[PDB]
């Protein structure tokens, strides 16, 4: 059997970076070399593991998390980064084991008026713990006076237009999970 990675990368609508979707990958085999070899991706970096050895390895599960961000925001999907997406949207652990893959989505996700359906969180009382997801839509109180002065809605929009640093970039995070349980996703052996 093959890991249905196609379901992830070639899906029609990706999540918004605040409600980032997660798919679990199990009981399958993946040609990881199909992924990295493609010039399609404007980013391919893995942390905690060399991609070539991915094919030699077994993992208890693999998690595919996908969302859309701005190109010049990509630098953040990486351990130890800071920023809106790093702090208020998607947080990778300091010690990561996975791969971060990104491509420009302007042809699909930019509209002429701006595509306002891709959203992000701009304010939060505190930062995300790694792999935490916050869809809370309650008013953010930025002022001493209770909103019940400096009161804001946490979620902004990207409003994507064919302007690349502000262009839509779809992102996939593959985290490689090892448990004391039988590995069910392995490379080609």
């Amino acid at each position, epitope marked *: 059997n093959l890991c249905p990675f196609g379901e992830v990368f070639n899906a029609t609508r990706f999540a918004s970076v605040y409600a980032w979707n997660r798919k679990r990958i199990s009981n399958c085999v993946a040609d990881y070399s199909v992924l990295y070899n493609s010039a399609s991706f404007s980013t391919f*970096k893995c942390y905690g593991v060399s991609p070539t050895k991915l094919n030699d390895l077994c993992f208890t599960n693999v998690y595919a998390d996908s969302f859309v961000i701005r190109g010049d925001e990509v630098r953040q999907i990486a351990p130890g980064q800071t920023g809106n997406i790093a702090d208020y949207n998607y947080k990778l652990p300091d010690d990561f084991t996975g791969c971060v893959i990104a491509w420009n989505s302007n042809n699909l996700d930019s509209k002429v008026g701006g595509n306002y359906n891709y959203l992000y969180r701009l304010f939060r009382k505190s930062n995300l713990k790694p792999f935490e997801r916050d869809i809370s839509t309650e008013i953010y109180q930025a002022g001493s006076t209770p909103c019940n002065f400096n009161c804001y809605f946490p979620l902004q929009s990207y409003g994507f237009q064919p302007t690349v640093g502000y262009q839509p970039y779809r992102v996939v995070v593959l985290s490689f999970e090892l448990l004391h349980a039988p590995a069910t996703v392995c490379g080609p052996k």
Partner: antibody
Amino acid sequence: EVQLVESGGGLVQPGGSLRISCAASGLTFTGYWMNWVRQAPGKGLEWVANIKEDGSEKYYVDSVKGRFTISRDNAKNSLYLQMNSLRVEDTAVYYCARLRWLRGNFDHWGQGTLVTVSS
Amino acid sequence: FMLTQPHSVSESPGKTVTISCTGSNGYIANNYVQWYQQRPGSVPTVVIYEDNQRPSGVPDRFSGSIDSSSNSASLIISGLKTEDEADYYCQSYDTPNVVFGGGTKLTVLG
């Protein structure tokens, strides 16, 4: 040990065409991305083009576009670079190299061939 | 997207040198960064690949680091020797093109 052997460098007039090859021995040349990267005298490395393992896609640097065509024969374990409409700026020792993976190192290189373009 | 390197860097034998490869118009830590040594009149050979991995048979003195904050990947040689005197190149790959640094001429004083 593995030697990457190139041939075909020489003198060509401006507007002329030259064809160069890299032939492999000691490695499977099939499963990898193949690339041409040149270096003019007293100058630095400049990537020139590359080609997918099965030949599906070919990519070139802007200044050679339309002028160079890169091809490969996996049966001969050979890489090819047709250079057309040649210009003076192209004068360089042309190295062939194989990247281990698409974003990784060039683990194997050729000894280099020089193309000179002038009168 | 482009890469800039210091034109020249010098440090004494037995010390440690860092050769920087800082990115213009892009993010260097978006994709892996690879390092290539070229001794006079010889073909480039790998010294560092995948930002910080070291090939077998390359001297142990060569390390690598990456700094997304300063937009730079770095090539480090612990405990320098005179034989390290060569030109050094960094490279990385944007989605359609392989991209090389200008090159660094390392000098070993004294």
